[PDB]
PDB file of C-alpha atoms and ligand atoms in Angstrom:
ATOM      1  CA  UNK A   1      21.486   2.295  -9.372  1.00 16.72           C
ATOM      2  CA  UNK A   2      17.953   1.430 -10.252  1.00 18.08           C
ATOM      3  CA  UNK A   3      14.974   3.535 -11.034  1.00 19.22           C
ATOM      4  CA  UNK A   4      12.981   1.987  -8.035  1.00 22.31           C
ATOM      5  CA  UNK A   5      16.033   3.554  -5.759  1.00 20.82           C
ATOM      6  CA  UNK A   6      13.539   6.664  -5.138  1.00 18.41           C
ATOM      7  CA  UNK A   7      11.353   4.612  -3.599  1.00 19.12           C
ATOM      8  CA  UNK A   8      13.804   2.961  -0.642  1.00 17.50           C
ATOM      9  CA  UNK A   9      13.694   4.219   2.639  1.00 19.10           C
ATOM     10  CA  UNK A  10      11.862   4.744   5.591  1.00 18.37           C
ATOM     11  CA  UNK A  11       8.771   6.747   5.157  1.00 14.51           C
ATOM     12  CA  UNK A  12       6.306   7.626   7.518  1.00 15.51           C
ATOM     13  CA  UNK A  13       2.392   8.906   6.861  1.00 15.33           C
ATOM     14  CA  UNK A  14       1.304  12.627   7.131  1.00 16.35           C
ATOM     15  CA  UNK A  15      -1.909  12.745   5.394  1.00 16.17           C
ATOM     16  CA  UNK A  16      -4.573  10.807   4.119  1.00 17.16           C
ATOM     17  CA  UNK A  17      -7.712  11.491   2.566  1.00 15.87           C
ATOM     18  CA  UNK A  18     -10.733   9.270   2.479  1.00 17.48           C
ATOM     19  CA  UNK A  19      -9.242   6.135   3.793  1.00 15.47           C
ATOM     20  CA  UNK A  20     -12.749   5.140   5.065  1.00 14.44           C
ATOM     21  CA  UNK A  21     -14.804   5.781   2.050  1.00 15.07           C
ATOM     22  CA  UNK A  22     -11.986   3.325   0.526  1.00 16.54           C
ATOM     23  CA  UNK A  23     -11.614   0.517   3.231  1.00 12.62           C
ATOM     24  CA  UNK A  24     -16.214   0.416   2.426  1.00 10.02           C
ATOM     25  CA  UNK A  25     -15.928  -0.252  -0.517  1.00  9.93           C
ATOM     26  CA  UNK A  26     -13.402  -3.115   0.292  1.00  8.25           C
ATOM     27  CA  UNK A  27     -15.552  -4.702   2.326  1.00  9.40           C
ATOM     28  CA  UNK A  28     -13.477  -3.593   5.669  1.00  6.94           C
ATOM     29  CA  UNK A  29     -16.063  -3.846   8.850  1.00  3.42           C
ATOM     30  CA  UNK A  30     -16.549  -0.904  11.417  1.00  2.63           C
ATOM     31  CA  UNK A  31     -13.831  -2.055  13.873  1.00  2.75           C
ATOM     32  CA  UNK A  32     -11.034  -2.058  11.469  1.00  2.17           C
ATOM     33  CA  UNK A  33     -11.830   0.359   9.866  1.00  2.00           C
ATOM     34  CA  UNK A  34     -11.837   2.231  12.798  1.00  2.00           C
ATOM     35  CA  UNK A  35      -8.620   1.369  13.954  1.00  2.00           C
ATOM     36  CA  UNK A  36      -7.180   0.945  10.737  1.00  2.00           C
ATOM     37  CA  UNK A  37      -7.763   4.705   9.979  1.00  2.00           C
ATOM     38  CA  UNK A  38      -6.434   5.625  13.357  1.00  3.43           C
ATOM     39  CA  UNK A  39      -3.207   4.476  12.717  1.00  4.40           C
ATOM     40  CA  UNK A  40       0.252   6.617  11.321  1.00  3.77           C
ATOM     41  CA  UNK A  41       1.720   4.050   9.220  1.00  2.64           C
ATOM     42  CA  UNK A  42       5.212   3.522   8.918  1.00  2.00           C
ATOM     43  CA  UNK A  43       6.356   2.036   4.681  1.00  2.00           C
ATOM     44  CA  UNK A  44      10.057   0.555   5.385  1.00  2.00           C
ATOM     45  CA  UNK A  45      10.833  -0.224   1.621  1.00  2.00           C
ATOM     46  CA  UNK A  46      14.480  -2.030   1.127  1.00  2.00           C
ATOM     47  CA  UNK A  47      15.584  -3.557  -2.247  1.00  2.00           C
ATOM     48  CA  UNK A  48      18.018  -6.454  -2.290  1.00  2.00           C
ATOM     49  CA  UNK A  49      18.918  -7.892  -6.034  1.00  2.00           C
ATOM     50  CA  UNK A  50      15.244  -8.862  -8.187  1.00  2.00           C
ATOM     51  CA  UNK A  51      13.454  -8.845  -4.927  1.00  2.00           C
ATOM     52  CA  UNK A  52      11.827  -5.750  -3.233  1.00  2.00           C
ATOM     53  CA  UNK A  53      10.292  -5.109   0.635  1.00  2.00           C
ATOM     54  CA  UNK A  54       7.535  -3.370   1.738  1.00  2.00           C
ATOM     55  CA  UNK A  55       6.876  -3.448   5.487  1.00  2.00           C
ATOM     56  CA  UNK A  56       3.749  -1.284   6.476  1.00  2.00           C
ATOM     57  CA  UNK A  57       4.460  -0.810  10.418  1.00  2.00           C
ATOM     58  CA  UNK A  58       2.043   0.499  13.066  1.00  2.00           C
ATOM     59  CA  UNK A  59       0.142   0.230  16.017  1.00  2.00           C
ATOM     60  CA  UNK A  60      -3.015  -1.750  14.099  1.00  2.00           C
ATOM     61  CA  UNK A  61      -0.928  -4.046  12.375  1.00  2.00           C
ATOM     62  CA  UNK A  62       2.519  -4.636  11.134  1.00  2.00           C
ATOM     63  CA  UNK A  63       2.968  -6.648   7.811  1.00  2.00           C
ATOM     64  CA  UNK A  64       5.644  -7.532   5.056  1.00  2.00           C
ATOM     65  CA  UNK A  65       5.251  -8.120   1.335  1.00  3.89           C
ATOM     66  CA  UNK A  66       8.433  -9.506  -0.312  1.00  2.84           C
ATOM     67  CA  UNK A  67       8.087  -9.555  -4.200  1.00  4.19           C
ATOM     68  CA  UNK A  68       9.575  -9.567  -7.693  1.00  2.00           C
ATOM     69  CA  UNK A  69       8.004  -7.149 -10.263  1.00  2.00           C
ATOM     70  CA  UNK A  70       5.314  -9.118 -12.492  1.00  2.00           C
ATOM     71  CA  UNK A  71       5.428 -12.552 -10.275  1.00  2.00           C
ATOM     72  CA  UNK A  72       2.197 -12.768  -8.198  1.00  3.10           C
ATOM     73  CA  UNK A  73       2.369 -13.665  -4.898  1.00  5.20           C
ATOM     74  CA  UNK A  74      -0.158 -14.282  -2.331  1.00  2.44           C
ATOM     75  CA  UNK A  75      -1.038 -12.046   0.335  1.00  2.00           C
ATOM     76  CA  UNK A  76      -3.041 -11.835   3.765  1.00  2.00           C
ATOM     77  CA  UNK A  77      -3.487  -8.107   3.932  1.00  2.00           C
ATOM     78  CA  UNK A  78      -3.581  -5.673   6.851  1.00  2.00           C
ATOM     79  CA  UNK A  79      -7.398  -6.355   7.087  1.00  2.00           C
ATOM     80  CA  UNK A  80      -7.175 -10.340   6.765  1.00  2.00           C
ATOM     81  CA  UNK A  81      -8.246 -10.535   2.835  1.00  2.00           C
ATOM     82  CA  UNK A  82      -6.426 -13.516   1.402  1.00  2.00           C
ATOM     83  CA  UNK A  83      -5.569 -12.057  -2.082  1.00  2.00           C
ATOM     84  CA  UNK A  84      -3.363 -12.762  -5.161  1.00  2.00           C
ATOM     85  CA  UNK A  85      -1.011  -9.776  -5.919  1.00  2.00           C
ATOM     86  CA  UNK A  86       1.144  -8.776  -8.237  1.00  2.00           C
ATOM     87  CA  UNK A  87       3.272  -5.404  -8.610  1.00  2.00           C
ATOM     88  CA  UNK A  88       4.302  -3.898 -11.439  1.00  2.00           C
ATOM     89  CA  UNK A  89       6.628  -0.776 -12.256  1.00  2.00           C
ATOM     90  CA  UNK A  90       4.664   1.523 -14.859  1.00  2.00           C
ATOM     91  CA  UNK A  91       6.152   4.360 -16.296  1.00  2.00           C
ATOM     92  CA  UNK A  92       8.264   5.439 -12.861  1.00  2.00           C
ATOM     93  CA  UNK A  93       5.147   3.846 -10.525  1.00  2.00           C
ATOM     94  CA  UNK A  94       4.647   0.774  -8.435  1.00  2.00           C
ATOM     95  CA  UNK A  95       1.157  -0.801  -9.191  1.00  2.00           C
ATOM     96  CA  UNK A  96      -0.254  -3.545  -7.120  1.00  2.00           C
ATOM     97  CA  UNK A  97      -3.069  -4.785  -8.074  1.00  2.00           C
ATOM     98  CA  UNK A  98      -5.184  -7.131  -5.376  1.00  2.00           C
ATOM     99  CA  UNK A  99      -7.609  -9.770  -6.606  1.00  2.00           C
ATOM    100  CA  UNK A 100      -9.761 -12.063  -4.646  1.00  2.00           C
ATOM    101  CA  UNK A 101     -13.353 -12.936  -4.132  1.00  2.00           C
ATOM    102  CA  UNK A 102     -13.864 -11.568  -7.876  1.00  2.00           C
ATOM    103  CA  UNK A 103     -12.942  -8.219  -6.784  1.00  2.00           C
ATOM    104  CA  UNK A 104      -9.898  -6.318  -7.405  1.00  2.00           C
ATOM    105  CA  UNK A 105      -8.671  -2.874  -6.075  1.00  2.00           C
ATOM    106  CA  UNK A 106      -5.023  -1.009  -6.788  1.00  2.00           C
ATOM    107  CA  UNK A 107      -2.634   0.443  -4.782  1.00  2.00           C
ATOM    108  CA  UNK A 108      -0.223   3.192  -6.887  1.00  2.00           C
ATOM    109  CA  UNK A 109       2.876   4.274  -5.166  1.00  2.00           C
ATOM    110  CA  UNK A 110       4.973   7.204  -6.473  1.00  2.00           C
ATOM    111  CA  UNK A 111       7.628  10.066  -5.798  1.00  2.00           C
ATOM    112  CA  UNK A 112       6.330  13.404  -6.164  1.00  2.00           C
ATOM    113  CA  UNK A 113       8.683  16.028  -4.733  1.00  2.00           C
ATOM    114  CA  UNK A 114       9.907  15.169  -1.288  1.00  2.00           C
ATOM    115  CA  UNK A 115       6.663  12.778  -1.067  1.00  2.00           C
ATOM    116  CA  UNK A 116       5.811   9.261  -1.562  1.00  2.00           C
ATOM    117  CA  UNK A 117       2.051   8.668  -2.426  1.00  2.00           C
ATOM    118  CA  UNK A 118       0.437   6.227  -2.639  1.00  2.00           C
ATOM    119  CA  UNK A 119      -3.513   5.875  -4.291  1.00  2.00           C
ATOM    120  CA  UNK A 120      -5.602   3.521  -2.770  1.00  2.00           C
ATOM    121  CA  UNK A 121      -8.752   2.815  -5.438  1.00  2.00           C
ATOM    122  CA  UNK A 122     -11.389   0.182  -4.996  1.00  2.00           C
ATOM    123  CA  UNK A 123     -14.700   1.183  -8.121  1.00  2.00           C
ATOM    124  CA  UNK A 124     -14.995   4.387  -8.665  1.00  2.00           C
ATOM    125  CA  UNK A 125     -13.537   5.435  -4.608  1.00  2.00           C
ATOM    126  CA  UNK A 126      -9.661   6.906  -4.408  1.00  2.00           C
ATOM    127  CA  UNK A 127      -7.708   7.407  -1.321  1.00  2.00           C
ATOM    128  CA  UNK A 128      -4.556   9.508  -1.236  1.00  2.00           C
ATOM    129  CA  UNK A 129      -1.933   8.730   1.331  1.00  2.00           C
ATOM    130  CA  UNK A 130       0.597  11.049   1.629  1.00  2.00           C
ATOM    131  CA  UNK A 131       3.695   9.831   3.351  1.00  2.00           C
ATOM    132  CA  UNK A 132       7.646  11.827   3.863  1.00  2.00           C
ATOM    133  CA  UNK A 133      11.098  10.478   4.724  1.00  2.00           C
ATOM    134  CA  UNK A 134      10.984   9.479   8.591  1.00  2.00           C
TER     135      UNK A 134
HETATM  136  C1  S8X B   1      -4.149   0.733   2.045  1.00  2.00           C
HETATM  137  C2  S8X B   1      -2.881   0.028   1.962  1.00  2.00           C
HETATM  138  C3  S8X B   1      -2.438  -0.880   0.991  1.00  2.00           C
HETATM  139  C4  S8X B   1      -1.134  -1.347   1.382  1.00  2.00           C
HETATM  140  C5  S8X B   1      -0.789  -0.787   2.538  1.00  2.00           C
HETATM  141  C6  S8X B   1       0.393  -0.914   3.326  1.00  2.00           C
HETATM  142  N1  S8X B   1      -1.774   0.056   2.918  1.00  2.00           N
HETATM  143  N2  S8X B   1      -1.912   0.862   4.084  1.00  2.00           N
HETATM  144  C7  S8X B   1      -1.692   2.221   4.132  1.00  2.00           C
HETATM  145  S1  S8X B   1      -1.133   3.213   2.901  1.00  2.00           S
HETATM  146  N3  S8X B   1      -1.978   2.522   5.385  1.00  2.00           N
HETATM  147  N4  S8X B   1      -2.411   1.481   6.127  1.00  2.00           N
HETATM  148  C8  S8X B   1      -2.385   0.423   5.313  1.00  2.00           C
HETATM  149  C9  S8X B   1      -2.718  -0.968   5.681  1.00  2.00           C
HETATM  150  C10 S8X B   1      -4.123  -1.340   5.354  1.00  2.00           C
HETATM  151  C11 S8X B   1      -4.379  -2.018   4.179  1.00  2.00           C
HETATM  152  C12 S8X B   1      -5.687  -2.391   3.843  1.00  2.00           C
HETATM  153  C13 S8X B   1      -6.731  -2.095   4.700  1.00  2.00           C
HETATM  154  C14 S8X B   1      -6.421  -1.463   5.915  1.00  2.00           C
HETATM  155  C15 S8X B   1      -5.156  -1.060   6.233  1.00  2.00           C
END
């Protein structure tokens, strides 16, 4: 076993709360954000040895982020930002922390109850996702 087994599965999205407000302050234009906030994710996370999956699955987009905790990697996220990530486990939570164009925003993933959420924040705007096993 490893701690990060809690997070492995197949989870799917039941609520979110301002996902807009968030994908602004990104920099996301109207369209995507549109359709972006339309879709019902599904988060496939898988571990295999050092490295862990996250595949983010739905009718806007469907992407994959293989990593190793601490060892940035580039990314080309849902929303076609080209950033530098790197994902950290913090006291029982996944941080990911996004940099690019001088700007940075953080994604925090963590089990609470039955749940998996996950805290989008970009400044001083948060957006809870709330996702359950599929
Ligand atoms: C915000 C975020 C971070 C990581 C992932 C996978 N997600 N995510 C969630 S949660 N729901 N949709 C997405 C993709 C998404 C990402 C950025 C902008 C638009 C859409």
């Amino acid at each position: 076993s490893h701690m990060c087994d809690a997070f492995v599965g197949t989870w799917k999205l039941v609520s979110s709360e301002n996902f807009d407000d968030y994908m602004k302050e990104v920099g996301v234009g109207f369209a995507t954000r549109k359709v972006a906030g339309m879709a019902k994710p599904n988060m496939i996370i898988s571990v295999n040895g050092d490295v862990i999956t996250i595949k983010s699955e739905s009718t806007f987009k469907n992407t994959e982020i293989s990593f190793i905790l601490g060892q940035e990697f580039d990314e080309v996220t849902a929303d076609d930002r080209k950033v530098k990530s790197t994902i950290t486990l913090d006291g029982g939570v996944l941080v990911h922390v996004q940099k690019w164009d001088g700007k940075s925003t953080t994604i925090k993933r963590k089990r609470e109850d039955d749940k998996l959420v996950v805290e989008c924040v970009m400044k001083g705007v948060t957006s809870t996702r709330v996702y359950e096993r599929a």
